[PDB]
């Protein structure tokens, strides 16, 4: 029966796509330490300028 | 069309889950489809709807529990109307909560009713105890018991406390109810007096021995009055609560006694729906439900409508439409039926279920089974009594359909009412042509029998004088004989002493002829069945040599029977040939050119020819089919051994059947004779006792004598010889007829329906 076979193929592609999305987003969660540093450097530079003004 | 097994259709469908319950229910409301089992692994925990069915299983037990309580209480279950299923939405949980509500209220309220009643009874005993004890270290005890125990109880007190116990007994003003059984019994109060705990223990041990109900008591009228005020308060309060407790139980029972009708329908349908859903499949990724069905080809539209409606009864939009299947195994076999046809299909199905598209015995059976029955069951009066019996079932039908079924005999005869009526009517027809009820004629016909004056013609006149002293035989000679007869059987053979010779010649030859005819119809049905299946080999190697074999053997016999009935007569009766002898000597080539005369010119040549022509058919049936099949399988590039086993068995059964099955129809004559004899004996041994020489003296006895006659003729003839003819005629169908054509192998089609509840 081709109708069920084609449906099973689409259901398999659907199960693959959600599983790949889970893996991609889990890798994005690990990137937080890379994206964080530019904000940390801006806070350091802001506090340096504030300290030099107070001096 | 019903002359053959109905055309089905295997279909596969994409059942949307939110429609699924609704669709299943609608299909079971239609009752014109069989689901395939698509879950070979189905089991109590493997089934996809464990919980849903298990909830139904428990809700059914809760229904049974509350119903048993209601039936013990004899509260009327209303049983009104007829109802749809529950919604697919989770409303079954509110229903389950309603089941729990009723159950918990019953268990609580029953326990309270019992406890409150028991307390009230004990306090009533205590009220009487306090009132009697008010007439009064030293001490005493008091209690109650069945009064008949008091004599033995008092003798035991002095037996144990050696000659020393003071006491008083007092019968209660009314009997009191037993707290467990509800038996009212004439109990009596007692009070017993003693010094110290040592005597207290003895009088108590005897009270325990007789199972007497002891109670504490205060020492003075004033302290007893204070206790009695407590008792009078408790007992009134208990009865007030108990009245309302019982009233509330009655509301709870009444609410449930409405609901059981509705809930039974809902639960049983729901259980069935989820059980059918458990036959479906759901693979691990699967969103919809895959399902498969057998439907009638005519009703493929009817189920598609039910699917669309099932979706429309739901929040779903998906119409769940089917594809027709092509890679099909042989479907289950279905036939539509009704009152005049259902029993006939059932007795056919009971030997075996026809192959898909196979010719159906049942429509031919609707006549031929009654016919064979009536040919055997050939009494006019029994035909009437059978007709009357079945008429009374058909006339009362609408009443009887409401009644009990637990009388299985009554269920069977009522379920046979249409078949029984038809055979009864045909048994009038056959019984009339045989001119016999109870070995009595009907005076409707004229006669070919000759009055005494016709024997007084100078010739044979002496025999009319001999008749005053000795038996005589009329040889049916011309001028004396009353001429060829135009009705059925001549009345005279009922009274004639030699009658059985004449009647046998008829019923034997008749039964033989009918048998040949029915077997020739069965092989004719084989051709039409092989045509519908488009099988050239089965016609060429089967039907053609088979019908030639049968016809060449059978045709001569029937032809010669008819020839004897035309070519011989009274003035040629002495030295006339035997029919049976010429048939045997044909089949065996064994005529010794002598003895019985040959009937017609060239008859020896015909005898030789027809037998040789039948013998020439055998190799086609036996072997040539297996040989061409072996070459076809070798060219088309199965077991040749098994092919020979099956084809040899079939060929042997047909060839030997042309002896045995040809003879088998003698059963008709056989039972017919038995029936006729039984009827004549049962009259002769009974009715003649009421045939006294005077009006009153005979007629009074004849009433009771005829009732014994009716009883015996019913039990023997109308019941048992009827059941004999019935079962024999079924056998004649199941083998001697059907074996020519009806394979009778297949699955019974089973429509899923609420009607199985």
From Swiss-Prot, chain B:
Indicate the principal place this protein occupies in or around the cell. Answer: membrane
Cytoplasmic compartment ranges equal 1-358, 397-411, 526-543, 737-757
Organism for this UniProt entry: Rattus norvegicus (Rat)
Gene of this entry: Atp6v0a1
Transferase in keyword set: no
> What's a BP term from Gene Ontology annotated to this protein?
synaptic vesicle lumen acidification
Subunit relationships: V-ATPase is a heteromultimeric enzyme made up of two complexes: the ATP-hydrolytic V1 complex and the proton translocation V0 complex. The V1 complex consists of three catalytic AB heterodimers that form a heterohexamer, three peripheral stalks each consisting of EG heterodimers, one central rotor including subunits D and F, and the regulatory subunits C and H. The proton translocation complex V0 consists of the proton transport subunit a, a ring of proteolipid subunits c9c'', rotary subunit d, subunits e and f, and the accessory subunits ATP6AP1/Ac45 and ATP6AP2/PRR. Interacts with SPAAR.
- Residues where Phosphothreonine occurs? 220, 330
Return the protein name.
V-type proton ATPase 116 kDa subunit a 1
Q: Provide this UniProt record's keywords sorted from A to Z.
A: Cytoplasmic vesicle, Hydrogen ion transport, Ion transport, Membrane, Phosphoprotein, Synapse, Transmembrane, Transmembrane helix, Transport
């Amino acid at each position: 029966s081709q109708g069920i076979q084609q449906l099973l193929q689409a259901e398999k592609r659907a199960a693959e796509k959600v599983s790949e999305a889970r893996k991609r987003k889990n890798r994005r969660l690990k990137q937080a330490k890379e994206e964080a540093q530019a904000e940390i450097e801006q806070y350091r530079l802001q506090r340096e300028k504030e300290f030099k003004a107070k001096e | 069309e019903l002359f053959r097994s109905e055309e089905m259709t295997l279909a596969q469908l994409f059942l949307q889950s939110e429609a699924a319950y609704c669709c299943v229910s609608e299909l079971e409301e239609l009752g014109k489809v069989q689901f395939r089992d698509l879950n070979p692994d189905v089991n109590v925990f493997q089934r996809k709807f464990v919980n849903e069915v298990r909830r139904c299983e428990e809700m059914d037990r809760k229904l049974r529990f509350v119903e048993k309580e209601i039936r013990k209480a004899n509260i009327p279950i209303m049983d009104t109307g007829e109802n749809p299923e529950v919604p697919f939405p989770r409303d079954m949980i509110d229903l389950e909560a309603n089941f729990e509500k009723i159950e918990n209220e019953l268990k609580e309220i029953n326990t309270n009713q019992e406890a409150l009643k028991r307390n009230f009874l004990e306090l009533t005993e205590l009220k009487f105890i306090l009132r009697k004890t008010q007439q009064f270290r030293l001490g005493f005890v008091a209690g109650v018991i069945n009064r008949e125990r008091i004599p033995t109880f008092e003798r035991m007190l002095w037996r144990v406390c050696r000659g020393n116990v003071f006491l008083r007994q007092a019968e209660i003003e009314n009997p009191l109810e037993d707290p467990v059984t509800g038996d009212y019994v004439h109990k009596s109060v007692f009070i017993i007096f003693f010094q110290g705990d040592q005597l207290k223990n003895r009088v108590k041990k005897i009270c325990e021995g007789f199972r007497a109900s002891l109670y504490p008591c205060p020492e003075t009228p004033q302290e007893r009055k204070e206790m009695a005020s407590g008792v009078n308060t408790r007992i009134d309060d208990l009865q007030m609560v108990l009245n309302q407790t019982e009233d509330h139980r009655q509301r709870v029972l009444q609410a449930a006694a409405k609901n059981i009708r509705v809930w039974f329908i809902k639960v049983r349908k729901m259980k069935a729906i989820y059980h059918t859903l458990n036959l479906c499949n759901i693979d691990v990724t699967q969103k919809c439900l895959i399902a498969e069905v057998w439907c009638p080809v005519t009703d493929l539209d009817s189920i598609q409508f039910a699917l669309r409606r099932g979706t429309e009864h739901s929040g779903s939009t998906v119409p769940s439409i089917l594809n027709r299947m092509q890679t099909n195994q042989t479907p289950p076999t279905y036939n539509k039926t009704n009152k005049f046809t259902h029993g006939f299909q059932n007795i056919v199905d009971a030997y075996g279920i026809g192959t898909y598209r196979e010719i159906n015995p049942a429509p031919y059976t609707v006549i031929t089974f009654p016919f064979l029955f009536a040919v055997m069951f050939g009494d006019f009066g029994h035909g009437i009594l059978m007709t009357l019996f079945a008429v009374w079932m058909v006339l009362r039908e609408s009443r009887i359909l409401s009644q009990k079924n637990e009388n299985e005999m009554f269920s069977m005869v009522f379920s046979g009412r249409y078949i029984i009526l038809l055979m009864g009517l045909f048994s009038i027809y056959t019984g009339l042509i045989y001119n016999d009820c109870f070995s009595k004629s009907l005076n409707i016909f004229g006669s070919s029998w000759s009055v005494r004056p016709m024997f007084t013609i100078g010739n044979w006149t002496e025999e009319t004088l001999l008749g005053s002293s000795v038996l005589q035989l009329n040889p049916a000679i011309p001028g004396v004989f009353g001429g060829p007869y135009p009705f059925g059987i001549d009345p005279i053979w009922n009274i004639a002493t030699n009658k059985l010779t004449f009647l046998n010649s008829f019923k034997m030859k008749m039964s033989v002829i009918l048998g040949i005819i029915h077997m020739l119809f069965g092989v004719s049905l084989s051709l039409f069945n092989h045509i519908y299946f488009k099988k050239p080999l089965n016609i060429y190697f089967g039907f053609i040599p088979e019908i030639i074999f049968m016809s060449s053997l059978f045709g001569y016999l029937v032809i010669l029977i008819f020839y004897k009935w035309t070519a011989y007569d009274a003035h040629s009766s002495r030295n006339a040939p035997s029919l049976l002898i010429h048939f045997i000597n044909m089949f065996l080539f064994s005529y010794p050119e002598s003895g019985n005369a040959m009937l017609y010119s060239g008859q020896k040549g015909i005898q030789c020819f027809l037998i040789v022509v039948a013998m020439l058919c055998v190799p086609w049936m036996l072997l040539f089919k297996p040989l061409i099949l072996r070459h076809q399988y070798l060219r088309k590039k199965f077991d040749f051994g098994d092919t020979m086993v099956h084809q040899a068995i079939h060929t042997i059964e047909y060839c030997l059947g042309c002896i045995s099955n040809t003879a088998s129809y003698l059963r008709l004559w056989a039972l017919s004779l038995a029936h006729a004899q039984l009827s004549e004996v049962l009259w002769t041994m009974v009715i003649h006792i009421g045939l006294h020489v005077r009006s009153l003296a005979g007629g009074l006895g004849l009433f009771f004598i005829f009732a014994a006659f009716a009883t015996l003729t019913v039990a023997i003839l109308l019941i048992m010889e009827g059941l004999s003819a019935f079962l024999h005629a079924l056998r004649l169908h199941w083998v001697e007829f059907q074996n020519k054509f009806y394979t009778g192998t297949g699955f019974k089609f089973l429509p899923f329906s609420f009607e199985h509840i």
